[PDB]
Amino acid sequence: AVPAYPFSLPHALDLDPHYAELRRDEPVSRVRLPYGEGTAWLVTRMSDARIVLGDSRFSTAAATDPATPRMFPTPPEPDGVLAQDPPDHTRLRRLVGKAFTARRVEEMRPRVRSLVDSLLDDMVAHGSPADLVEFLAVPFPVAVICELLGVPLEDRDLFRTFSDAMLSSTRLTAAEIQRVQQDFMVYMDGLVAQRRDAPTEDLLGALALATDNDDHLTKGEIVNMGVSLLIAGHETSVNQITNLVHLLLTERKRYESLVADPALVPAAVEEMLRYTPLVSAGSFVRVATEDVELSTVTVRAGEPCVVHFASANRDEEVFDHADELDFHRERNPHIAFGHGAHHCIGAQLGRLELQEALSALVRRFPTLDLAEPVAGLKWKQGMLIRGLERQIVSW
Ligand code: HEM
Ligand SMILES: CC[C@H]1OC(=O)[C@H](C)[C@@H](O)[C@H](C)[C@@H](O)[C@@H](C)C[C@@H](C)C(=O)[C@H](C)[C@@H](O)[C@H]1C
């Protein structure tokens, strides 16, 4: 009876035109998600998005029930941050949030700028043409989160594999993913356990203290924070570097406009954050705990809702010429980093990383162009997020 969401297999970074139709004439529409049972409201507009994400009457904890609609094979892990409601959620985030403040993240620009340069030095050693993914997109975020978290850099292939499986949408089965979660939890649990009598000066260390020094928080929750930070810490930024670079080079003018004014980069990062559907479709589901008014509908208590971040970021009531990509927007109140209690904790880290990668490239490689055809570009399929597996560039 009700439409299947996602509405189509994704292509590149392009939005299904049905989102625009929905925004205009049915901003809160009912849908059938690929897993779980029953039905959920899809929220396509910014005003409503902020209510689902921002309001205390929406619970993510309530979506841990296997019967709830969701975008992924496995029932959500109860111990994950996305599934915690405040105040427990607040305490959990407090454990680690100090290190992610705008101010602390800013402290890293120097380590991060060196790291980027070093990895771009190794790209020039190789010489054009080269795979931007191989040389920059993967190794840069991976190094940063490894050094931040205190995760062995030699284990990249291990945690990348794990992380890719947990961000599966259509690709893997419930059992394959459920398998990987236990391995990953055991891996992380072993990693924090190494600090029982070898305390470290890193997040995993702080995480280890919390497991032997906390009454409010379970060990499952504390350990799962480590896996959430490690998955997110690289999966987002790695794909997001390729996404911005794709958007820049497909219409060379954009890349050209940044070479002209490298101070634009930060605003262009914020723009491309708004434009890009990093989350391919949907979001972690929020279940209403009381009736809640949206634009066109009152969501009833127990009814699930899901948000498409990218569609809210194409809302014509809040962005002028929203279907157009523009680095000179005066205001840009996007929700590329979500909104409310679960606003991404690495928003400042992601920004730092994207700024520094894009700056360095725009300074150093003015003659950067896509050295493979747009048609054969290998976008990743059946994962909850989008990005390229390779990006061969010439200079
Ligand atoms: C370009 C970079 C990034 C983008 C676009 C991005 C996007 C998002 C979005 C949209 C959410 C909201 C999910 C929801 O509430 O339904 C989110 C949550 C999250 N992000 Fe990110 N993110 C980025 C970078 C990072 C980084 C670098 C880390 C970690 C180092 C990270 C860790 C997280 C975590 C843990 C959450 C969930 C926290 C919670 O449940 O409260 N993200 N991110
Ligand atoms: C339905 C789409 C979402 O994926 C999920 O909910 C996944 C099942 C989460 O368990 C993933 C693996 C967690 O590690 C996140 C903390 C990663 C972080 C980057 C995000 O929050 C991300 C935006 C995420 O919410 C969306 C991709």
Coordinates of C-alpha atoms and ligand atoms in Angstrom, one line a residue:
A1 CA 0.0 0.0 0.0
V2 CA 2.6 2.7 1.1
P3 CA 5.7 3.5 -0.9
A4 CA 9.0 1.7 -0.4
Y5 CA 11.8 3.9 1.0
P6 CA 14.4 4.2 -0.3
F7 CA 12.6 5.3 -3.5
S8 CA 15.4 4.1 -5.8
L9 CA 18.9 2.8 -6.0
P10 CA 21.1 5.8 -5.5
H11 CA 23.1 7.3 -8.4
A12 CA 26.3 9.4 -7.7
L13 CA 25.4 12.3 -5.3
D14 CA 22.1 13.0 -7.1
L15 CA 18.8 13.4 -5.3
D16 CA 15.7 11.4 -6.3
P17 CA 13.4 14.2 -7.7
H18 CA 10.6 12.8 -5.6
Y19 CA 12.1 14.5 -2.6
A20 CA 11.4 17.9 -4.2
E21 CA 7.8 16.9 -5.0
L22 CA 7.4 15.7 -1.4
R23 CA 8.9 18.9 0.1
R24 CA 6.4 20.9 -2.0
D25 CA 3.1 18.9 -1.7
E26 CA 3.6 16.1 0.9
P27 CA 6.4 17.1 3.3
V28 CA 5.5 14.4 5.8
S29 CA 4.7 11.2 3.9
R30 CA 4.3 7.6 5.0
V31 CA 6.8 5.0 3.8
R32 CA 7.9 1.3 4.2
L33 CA 11.5 1.0 5.3
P34 CA 13.6 -1.9 4.0
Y35 CA 13.8 -3.6 7.5
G36 CA 11.7 -3.8 10.6
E37 CA 7.9 -4.0 10.5
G38 CA 5.1 -1.5 9.8
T39 CA 5.4 2.0 8.7
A40 CA 7.2 5.3 9.3
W41 CA 6.8 9.0 8.5
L42 CA 9.5 10.4 6.1
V43 CA 10.4 14.0 7.0
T44 CA 11.7 15.9 3.9
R45 CA 11.7 19.5 5.1
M46 CA 13.9 21.5 7.4
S47 CA 11.3 22.8 9.8
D48 CA 10.0 19.3 10.5
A49 CA 13.5 17.8 10.5
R50 CA 14.5 20.0 13.4
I51 CA 11.4 18.9 15.4
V52 CA 12.1 15.1 14.8
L53 CA 15.8 15.6 15.6
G54 CA 15.4 18.4 18.3
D55 CA 12.3 17.6 20.3
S56 CA 12.4 15.6 23.6
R57 CA 9.2 13.7 22.6
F58 CA 11.1 11.8 20.0
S59 CA 13.1 8.8 21.3
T60 CA 15.8 7.0 19.5
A61 CA 16.1 4.4 22.3
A62 CA 12.6 3.3 21.4
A63 CA 13.8 2.3 17.9
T64 CA 15.9 -0.5 19.4
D65 CA 12.9 -2.8 19.2
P66 CA 13.4 -5.2 16.3
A67 CA 9.8 -4.5 15.1
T68 CA 10.6 -0.8 14.5
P69 CA 11.3 0.3 10.9
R70 CA 14.9 1.0 10.2
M71 CA 17.2 1.5 7.2
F72 CA 19.7 -1.3 8.0
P73 CA 19.6 -5.2 8.4
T74 CA 20.4 -5.5 12.1
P75 CA 18.1 -4.3 14.9
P76 CA 20.0 -1.3 16.4
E77 CA 22.5 -2.0 19.1
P78 CA 20.8 -0.7 22.4
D79 CA 24.3 0.3 23.8
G80 CA 25.1 2.7 20.8
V81 CA 24.9 6.5 21.3
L82 CA 22.3 6.9 18.5
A83 CA 20.0 4.6 20.6
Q84 CA 20.5 6.4 24.0
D85 CA 18.1 9.1 25.1
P86 CA 19.0 11.9 27.5
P87 CA 20.0 12.1 30.2
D88 CA 21.9 8.8 29.8
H89 CA 22.9 10.0 26.3
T90 CA 24.2 13.2 27.8
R91 CA 26.4 11.4 30.3
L92 CA 27.7 9.0 27.6
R93 CA 28.7 11.9 25.4
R94 CA 30.3 13.7 28.3
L95 CA 32.7 10.8 28.7
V96 CA 34.4 11.8 25.5
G97 CA 33.0 15.2 24.3
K98 CA 35.8 17.4 25.8
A99 CA 38.2 16.3 23.0
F100 CA 35.8 17.3 20.2
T101 CA 35.0 20.9 21.2
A102 CA 35.7 23.6 18.5
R103 CA 38.6 24.8 20.6
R104 CA 40.4 21.4 21.1
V105 CA 39.8 20.3 17.6
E106 CA 41.3 23.7 16.5
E107 CA 44.5 22.7 18.5
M108 CA 45.0 20.0 15.9
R109 CA 45.2 22.1 12.8
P110 CA 49.0 22.0 13.0
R111 CA 49.3 18.1 13.3
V112 CA 46.6 17.7 10.7
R113 CA 48.2 20.2 8.2
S114 CA 51.6 18.3 8.4
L115 CA 49.9 15.0 8.0
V116 CA 48.1 16.2 4.9
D117 CA 51.3 17.6 3.5
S118 CA 53.2 14.4 4.2
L119 CA 50.5 12.4 2.4
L120 CA 50.5 14.9 -0.5
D121 CA 54.3 14.6 -0.7
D122 CA 54.0 10.9 -1.1
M123 CA 51.4 11.5 -3.8
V124 CA 53.9 13.7 -5.8
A125 CA 56.7 11.1 -5.3
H126 CA 54.4 8.7 -7.2
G127 CA 53.6 11.3 -9.8
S128 CA 50.4 12.0 -11.9
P129 CA 48.2 10.3 -12.6
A130 CA 47.3 8.8 -9.1
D131 CA 44.4 7.6 -7.0
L132 CA 43.3 10.4 -4.7
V133 CA 41.6 7.9 -2.5
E134 CA 44.7 5.8 -2.1
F135 CA 46.9 8.7 -1.4
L136 CA 44.7 11.1 0.5
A137 CA 41.1 10.3 1.3
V138 CA 41.7 7.0 3.1
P139 CA 45.0 7.5 4.8
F140 CA 44.4 11.1 6.1
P141 CA 41.2 10.6 8.2
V142 CA 42.4 7.2 9.2
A143 CA 45.7 8.5 10.7
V144 CA 43.9 11.3 12.5
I145 CA 41.3 9.2 14.2
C146 CA 43.9 6.5 15.0
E147 CA 46.2 9.0 16.7
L148 CA 43.2 10.7 18.4
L149 CA 41.6 7.5 19.6
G150 CA 44.9 5.6 20.1
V151 CA 44.1 2.8 17.7
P152 CA 46.9 0.9 16.0
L153 CA 47.4 2.4 12.5
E154 CA 48.5 -1.1 11.3
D155 CA 44.9 -2.3 11.9
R156 CA 43.4 -0.1 9.2
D157 CA 42.4 -3.0 6.9
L158 CA 40.9 -4.7 9.9
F159 CA 38.7 -1.9 11.2
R160 CA 37.9 -0.6 7.6
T161 CA 36.5 -4.0 6.7
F162 CA 34.5 -4.1 10.0
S163 CA 33.4 -0.5 9.6
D164 CA 32.3 -1.0 6.0
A165 CA 30.1 -4.0 7.0
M166 CA 28.4 -2.1 9.8
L167 CA 27.5 0.7 7.4
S168 CA 25.9 -1.8 5.1
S169 CA 22.4 -1.1 3.8
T170 CA 21.4 -3.7 1.1
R171 CA 24.9 -5.3 0.7
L172 CA 25.2 -7.7 3.6
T173 CA 22.7 -9.8 5.5
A174 CA 21.7 -9.3 9.1
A175 CA 23.8 -12.3 10.2
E176 CA 27.0 -11.2 8.4
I177 CA 26.7 -7.7 10.1
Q178 CA 25.6 -9.2 13.5
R179 CA 28.8 -11.3 13.1
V180 CA 31.0 -8.3 12.5
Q181 CA 29.5 -6.3 15.4
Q182 CA 30.6 -9.0 17.9
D183 CA 34.1 -9.1 16.4
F184 CA 34.3 -5.3 16.5
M185 CA 33.1 -5.1 20.0
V186 CA 35.6 -7.8 21.1
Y187 CA 38.4 -5.9 19.2
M188 CA 37.5 -2.6 20.9
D189 CA 37.0 -4.3 24.2
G190 CA 40.5 -5.9 23.9
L191 CA 41.9 -2.5 22.9
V192 CA 40.6 -0.7 26.0
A193 CA 41.5 -3.7 28.2
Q194 CA 45.2 -3.1 27.3
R195 CA 45.0 0.0 29.5
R196 CA 44.0 -1.7 32.7
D197 CA 47.6 -1.2 33.9
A198 CA 48.9 0.7 30.9
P199 CA 46.8 3.9 31.0
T200 CA 47.2 6.0 27.9
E201 CA 46.9 9.7 27.0
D202 CA 44.1 9.2 24.5
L203 CA 40.4 8.6 24.1
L204 CA 40.7 4.8 24.5
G205 CA 42.5 5.6 27.8
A206 CA 39.8 7.9 29.0
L207 CA 37.3 5.1 27.9
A208 CA 39.2 2.6 30.0
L209 CA 39.2 4.8 33.1
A210 CA 35.4 5.2 32.7
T211 CA 34.8 1.4 32.6
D212 CA 36.6 0.9 36.0
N213 CA 35.3 4.3 37.4
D214 CA 31.6 4.6 36.4
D215 CA 28.2 3.7 38.0
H216 CA 25.7 5.3 35.5
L217 CA 27.3 3.9 32.4
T218 CA 27.6 0.2 31.4
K219 CA 30.7 -1.3 29.9
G220 CA 28.7 -2.1 26.7
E221 CA 27.9 1.5 26.3
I222 CA 31.5 2.8 27.0
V223 CA 33.1 0.2 24.7
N224 CA 30.5 0.8 21.9
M225 CA 31.5 4.5 22.1
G226 CA 35.0 3.5 21.0
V227 CA 33.6 1.5 18.0
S228 CA 31.2 4.4 17.1
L229 CA 34.0 6.9 17.2
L230 CA 36.3 4.7 15.1
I231 CA 33.7 3.9 12.4
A232 CA 32.5 7.4 12.1
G233 CA 35.9 9.0 12.6
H234 CA 37.1 7.8 9.2
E235 CA 34.0 6.6 7.2
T236 CA 32.5 10.1 7.1
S237 CA 35.6 12.1 6.2
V238 CA 37.1 9.6 3.8
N239 CA 34.0 9.5 1.6
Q240 CA 33.4 13.2 2.1
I241 CA 36.8 14.2 0.8
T242 CA 36.0 12.3 -2.5
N243 CA 32.5 13.8 -2.6
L244 CA 33.7 17.4 -2.4
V245 CA 36.5 16.7 -4.8
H246 CA 34.0 15.1 -7.2
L247 CA 31.7 18.1 -7.0
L248 CA 34.6 20.4 -7.5
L249 CA 36.2 18.7 -10.5
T250 CA 32.9 17.7 -12.4
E251 CA 32.3 21.5 -12.9
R252 CA 35.9 22.8 -12.9
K253 CA 34.7 26.4 -12.3
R254 CA 34.1 25.5 -8.6
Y255 CA 37.6 24.2 -8.1
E256 CA 38.9 27.2 -10.1
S257 CA 36.9 29.6 -7.9
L258 CA 38.7 28.2 -4.8
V259 CA 42.2 28.5 -6.4
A260 CA 41.3 32.1 -7.0
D261 CA 40.3 32.7 -3.3
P262 CA 41.6 29.9 -0.9
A263 CA 39.8 31.8 1.9
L264 CA 36.5 30.6 0.3
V265 CA 37.3 26.9 1.2
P266 CA 35.6 27.0 4.7
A267 CA 32.4 28.5 3.2
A268 CA 32.5 26.1 0.2
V269 CA 33.0 23.1 2.7
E270 CA 29.8 24.2 4.5
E271 CA 28.1 24.5 1.1
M272 CA 29.2 21.2 -0.1
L273 CA 28.2 19.7 3.2
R274 CA 24.7 21.0 2.7
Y275 CA 24.6 19.8 -0.9
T276 CA 26.1 16.3 -0.5
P277 CA 23.9 13.4 0.5
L278 CA 26.6 11.6 2.5
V279 CA 23.8 9.7 4.3
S280 CA 22.4 8.0 1.2
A281 CA 18.8 7.7 2.5
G282 CA 16.9 8.0 5.8
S283 CA 18.5 8.2 9.2
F284 CA 18.4 6.5 12.6
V285 CA 14.7 6.3 13.4
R286 CA 13.0 8.5 16.0
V287 CA 9.8 7.2 17.7
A288 CA 7.4 9.7 19.1
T289 CA 6.7 9.1 22.8
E290 CA 3.8 11.7 22.9
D291 CA 1.8 13.3 20.0
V292 CA 3.8 15.9 18.2
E293 CA 2.7 18.5 15.6
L294 CA 4.7 18.7 12.3
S295 CA 3.9 21.0 9.4
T296 CA 1.1 18.9 7.8
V297 CA 0.6 16.2 10.4
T298 CA 0.4 15.3 14.1
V299 CA 2.6 12.3 14.6
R300 CA 1.0 10.0 17.2
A301 CA 2.8 8.5 20.2
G302 CA 4.4 5.2 19.0
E303 CA 4.6 6.3 15.4
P304 CA 8.2 6.2 13.9
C305 CA 9.8 8.9 11.9
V306 CA 12.8 9.1 9.7
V307 CA 14.6 12.1 8.2
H308 CA 16.4 12.7 4.9
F309 CA 19.1 15.2 5.9
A310 CA 19.9 16.1 2.2
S311 CA 16.3 16.9 1.4
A312 CA 16.1 19.3 4.4
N313 CA 19.3 20.8 3.0
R314 CA 17.4 21.5 -0.3
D315 CA 14.5 23.3 1.4
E316 CA 13.6 26.4 -0.7
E317 CA 12.1 28.1 2.3
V318 CA 15.5 28.3 4.0
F319 CA 17.9 28.2 1.1
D320 CA 17.7 30.5 -1.9
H321 CA 18.4 28.7 -5.2
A322 CA 18.8 25.4 -3.2
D323 CA 19.2 23.1 -6.2
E324 CA 22.2 25.3 -7.2
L325 CA 25.7 25.0 -5.5
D326 CA 26.9 28.4 -4.3
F327 CA 30.0 29.4 -2.1
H328 CA 28.7 32.9 -1.4
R329 CA 25.6 32.1 0.6
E330 CA 25.3 34.7 3.4
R331 CA 23.6 32.2 5.8
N332 CA 23.9 28.4 5.7
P333 CA 21.9 26.8 8.5
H334 CA 22.3 23.2 7.1
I335 CA 21.9 20.0 9.1
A336 CA 24.6 18.0 7.3
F337 CA 25.9 17.3 10.8
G338 CA 22.4 16.5 12.1
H339 CA 20.7 18.6 14.8
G340 CA 19.6 18.3 18.5
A341 CA 20.9 15.8 21.0
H342 CA 22.7 13.6 18.4
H343 CA 24.3 16.4 16.4
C344 CA 27.6 14.7 15.3
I345 CA 30.3 15.1 17.9
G346 CA 33.0 15.3 15.2
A347 CA 31.4 18.2 13.4
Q348 CA 34.4 20.3 14.2
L349 CA 36.8 17.5 13.4
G350 CA 35.1 16.8 10.1
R351 CA 35.3 20.5 9.2
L352 CA 38.9 20.8 10.2
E353 CA 39.8 17.8 8.0
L354 CA 37.7 18.9 5.0
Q355 CA 39.1 22.4 5.2
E356 CA 42.7 21.2 5.5
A357 CA 42.4 18.6 2.7
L358 CA 40.7 21.0 0.3
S359 CA 43.0 24.0 1.2
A360 CA 46.2 22.0 0.7
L361 CA 45.0 20.7 -2.7
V362 CA 43.8 24.1 -3.9
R363 CA 47.1 25.8 -2.9
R364 CA 49.4 23.1 -4.3
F365 CA 47.6 21.5 -7.3
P366 CA 46.0 24.3 -9.4
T367 CA 45.9 22.0 -12.4
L368 CA 43.9 19.2 -10.7
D369 CA 41.4 17.4 -13.0
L370 CA 39.5 14.1 -13.1
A371 CA 41.7 11.6 -14.9
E372 CA 38.9 9.0 -15.4
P373 CA 35.5 9.4 -17.0
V374 CA 32.4 10.3 -15.0
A375 CA 30.5 7.3 -16.4
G376 CA 32.9 4.6 -15.1
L377 CA 33.4 6.3 -11.6
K378 CA 33.1 3.6 -9.0
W379 CA 30.5 4.8 -6.4
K380 CA 30.1 2.5 -3.4
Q381 CA 26.8 0.5 -3.5
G382 CA 24.6 -0.9 -0.8
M383 CA 26.1 1.0 2.1
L384 CA 24.2 3.6 4.3
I385 CA 26.6 6.3 3.0
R386 CA 28.0 7.4 -0.4
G387 CA 31.5 8.0 -1.7
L388 CA 34.0 6.8 -4.3
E389 CA 36.2 3.7 -4.1
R390 CA 38.8 5.4 -6.2
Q391 CA 39.4 8.9 -7.7
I392 CA 42.2 9.1 -10.3
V393 CA 43.4 12.6 -10.7
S394 CA 46.0 14.3 -12.8
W395 CA 48.2 17.4 -12.3
Ligands
HEM1 C1 32.0 15.4 7.1 C2 32.0 14.8 8.3 C3 30.8 14.3 9.0 C4 29.5 14.4 8.6 C5 28.9 15.0 7.4 C6 28.8 13.7 9.7 C7 27.4 13.6 9.7 C8 26.7 13.1 10.8 C9 25.3 13.2 11.0 C10 24.3 13.7 10.0 C11 25.0 12.7 12.2 C12 23.6 12.6 12.9 C13 22.9 11.2 13.0 C14 21.5 11.3 13.7 O1 21.4 11.9 14.7 O2 20.6 10.7 13.3 C15 26.2 12.3 12.8 C16 26.3 11.7 14.0 C17 27.5 11.3 14.6 N1 28.8 11.5 14.1 FE1 29.2 12.4 12.4 N2 29.7 13.4 10.7 C18 30.9 13.7 10.3 C19 32.1 13.4 10.9 C20 32.3 12.7 12.1 C21 33.5 12.4 12.8 C22 34.8 12.9 12.3 C23 33.2 11.6 13.9 C24 34.0 11.1 15.0 C25 35.3 11.4 15.1 C26 31.7 11.5 13.9 C27 31.0 10.8 14.8 C28 29.6 10.9 14.9 C29 28.9 10.3 16.0 C30 29.4 9.5 17.2 C31 27.6 10.5 15.8 C32 26.4 10.1 16.7 C33 26.5 10.8 18.1 C34 25.2 10.7 18.8 O3 24.4 9.7 18.7 O4 24.9 11.6 19.6 N3 31.2 12.2 12.8 N4 27.2 12.6 12.0
LIG2 C1 20.7 5.0 9.0 C2 21.9 5.8 8.6 C3 22.8 6.0 9.7 O1 23.5 4.8 10.0 C4 23.3 4.1 11.3 O2 22.4 4.4 12.0 C5 24.2 3.0 11.6 C6 23.4 1.7 11.9 C7 25.1 3.4 12.8 O3 25.2 2.3 13.8 C8 26.6 3.7 12.4 C9 27.4 2.5 11.9 C10 27.3 4.4 13.6 O4 28.7 4.0 13.7 C11 27.2 5.9 13.4 C12 27.5 6.5 14.8 C13 28.1 6.6 12.4 C14 27.9 8.1 12.2 C15 28.7 8.7 11.1 C16 26.5 8.5 12.1 O5 25.8 8.8 13.0 C17 25.8 8.4 10.7 C18 25.5 9.7 10.1 C19 24.6 7.4 10.8 O6 23.7 8.0 11.8 C20 23.8 7.2 9.5 C21 24.7 6.8 8.3

